[PDB]
Design a binder for this molecule. Structure first.
Ligand SMILES: Cc1cc2nc3c(=O)[nH]c(=O)nc-3n(C[C@H](O)[C@H](O)[C@H](O)COP(=O)(O)OP(=O)(O)OC[C@H]3O[C@@H](n4cnc5c(N)ncnc54)[C@H](O)[C@@H]3O)c2cc1C
Length: 422
């Protein structure tokens, strides 16, 4: 609006993508990015992959080159923590006491690592006990990915698995602990969890499921972890401990500002929070999925880009793209893993291919409806799966597992059934 000033809280992929999106959709007003992080906004996925492997330059991580902020006239204010929002005056209050005025406010606060209770005090503070979320976290762990050293990963989520895969490649003695009965218990089917556990075990990782960490042993001098103790009494000697038991959405700001909060900042079809002038986006945002007809909060890059762009369109009086099936990816041992949709509430699963090799797709179904698909080294079936989920195609369930029948044809028939037959 040439006059309307927009303020974005959070310099993560979400906030940065909103900033450049805005200026790309023809926003002439001023754009301010305020983030507590001091570093240059960078990519996160590399931190448990190539960067964690020391095979990518720090420079390749930048979301956008520093010149780009200048060129696009985007003001970046780092190392600054926003402590409050005054919806009334329409201001943002910094930790130094300063205040910024806004006509439009975007909350791209992401989330923070969920603290491991038995790791409070000295444990957490140790140089060899880290969580993985910041550039600093990554480099600190990378400096310690040492051959023959012993690593204990506490947490069996995708990042946990990606870390274990990188540490293994680095020839460390790796042990991964999960309280769940099987890795990725909540988001995949048993046979899928079996694939990962065998993949990693085969690779050398010792996975201990249904295992709980009661505490740690430490050295009095260095104040470093020396071992991980399990509830069952097992002692795991450790040189490095990487904890990851989930993410906590940063909602405090909206919470104290009277905005609706529920395991994330609540937004409507227009990305608006309880307050019309305030929008939320990214890992922090809880929105309604019309595709699944329920409130969700996605923590993924594609989710950030989709939401970010939508916000830019709206604020620029443009029309937002139609909701797209959610998806994300994971890279482990060079295996291309891509997942689309949300598997919650599935009745059965159908495996298209053999689970005895990284080359198959797993369709998650609730009745005859396909909820999600996890593909392993199948980029084309993944793209085709996107279509099915998004457009709710009536693909024939009994043909999904049959590999003699191309997925393209199964889809073609489903679309044909939609046209000529009621
Ligand atoms: C190691 C790792 C690997 C990943 N790999 C993948 C992957 O392979 N594929 C995929 O799809 N996704 C992956 N993700 C997730 C993906 O990176 C994120 O979902 C995406 O980048 C969106 O992040 P965000 O910007 O919403 O939140 P964040 O990246 O957390 O950004 C929010 C920023 O706002 C700051 N902030 C919060 N409150 C305030 C405040 N009051 N004042 C100032 N600043 C504040 C936060 O400190 C933070 O810097 C990975 C994440 C990690 C950590």
């Amino acid at each position: 609006n040439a006059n309307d000033n927009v303020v974005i809280v959070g310099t993560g992929l979400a906030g940065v993508e909103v900033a450049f999106g805005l200026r790309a959709s023809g926003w002439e007003g001023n754009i301010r990015l305020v983030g507590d992080a001091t570093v240059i906004p960078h990519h996160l996925p590399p931190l448990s992959k190539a960067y964690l492997a020391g095979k990518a330059t720090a420079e390749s991580l930048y979301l956008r080159t520093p010149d780009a902020y200048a060129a696009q006239n985007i003001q970046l204010l780092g190392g600054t923590q926003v402590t409050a929002i005054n919806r009334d005056r329409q201001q943002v209050i910094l930790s130094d006491g300063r205040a910024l005025d806004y006509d439009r406010l975007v909350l791209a606060t992401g989330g923070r690592p969920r603290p491991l209770p038995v790791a409070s005090g000295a444990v957490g503070k140790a140089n060899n006990f880290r969580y993985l979320r910041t550039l600093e976290d990554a480099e600190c762990i990378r400096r310690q990915l040492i051959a023959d050293n012993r690593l204990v990963v506490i947490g069996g989520g995708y990042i946990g698995l990606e870390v274990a895969a990188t540490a293994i490649k680095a020839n460390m003695h790796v042990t991964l602990l999960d309280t769940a009965a099987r890795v990725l218990e909540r988001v995949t089917a048993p046979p899928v969890s079996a694939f990962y556990e065998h993949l990693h075990r085969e690779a050398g990782v010792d996975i201990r499921t249904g295992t709980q960490v009661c505490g740690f042993e430490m050295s009095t001098d260095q104040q470093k972890v020396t071992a991980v103790l399990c509830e069952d009494g097992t002692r795991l000697p450790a040189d490095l401990v990487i904890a990851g038991i989930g993410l906590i959405p940063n909602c405090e700001l909206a919470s104290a500002a009277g905005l609706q909060v529920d395991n994330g900042i609540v937004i409507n079809e227009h990305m608006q929070t309880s307050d019309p002038l305030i929008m939320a986006v990214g890992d922090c945002a809880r929105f309604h999925s019309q595709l699944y007809d329920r409130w969700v909060r996605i923590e993924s890059v594609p989710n950030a880009l989709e939401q970010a762009r939508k916000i830019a369109a709206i604020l620029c009086g443009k029309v937002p793209r139609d909701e797209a099936a959610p998806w994300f990816w994971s890279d482990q041992y060079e295996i291309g893993l891509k997942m689309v949709g949300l598997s919650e509430g599935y009745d059965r699963i159908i495996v298209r291919g053999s689970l005895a090799q990284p080359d198959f797709s797993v369709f998650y179904l609730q009745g005859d409806r396909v909820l999600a698909v996890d593909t392993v080294n199948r980029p084309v079936e993944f793209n085709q799966s996107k279509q099915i989920i998004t457009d709710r195609l009536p693909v024939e369930p009994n043909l999904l597992g049959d590999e003699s029948v191309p997925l393209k044809e199964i889809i073609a028939a489903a679309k044909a059934e939609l046209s000529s037959a009621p």
